[PDB]
Structure formats: structure tokens, C-alpha cells
Amino acid sequence: LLKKVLALLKKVL
């Protein structure tokens, strides 16, 4: 699941 990468995007998004 691309949640590992997505969840880390909340640092900039």
C-alpha cells in the first residue's frame, strides 16, 4: 500500500 509514502507527504502537504 502506498500509505507509507503518502503518510510522509503530510509533512509538506
Tab-separated table of C-alpha atoms in Angstrom:
chain	number	residue	atom	x	y	z
A	1	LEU	CA	0.000	0.000	0.000
A	2	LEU	CA	1.283	3.459	-0.937
A	3	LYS	CA	0.349	4.724	2.517
A	4	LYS	CA	3.894	4.648	3.780
A	5	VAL	CA	4.824	7.187	1.130
A	6	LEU	CA	1.538	9.085	1.315
A	7	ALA	CA	1.569	9.479	5.088
A	8	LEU	CA	5.025	11.053	4.857
A	9	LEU	CA	3.703	13.596	2.358
A	10	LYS	CA	1.681	15.204	5.163
A	11	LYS	CA	4.918	16.875	6.215
A	12	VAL	CA	4.784	19.156	3.187
A	13	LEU	CA	1.167	18.809	2.039
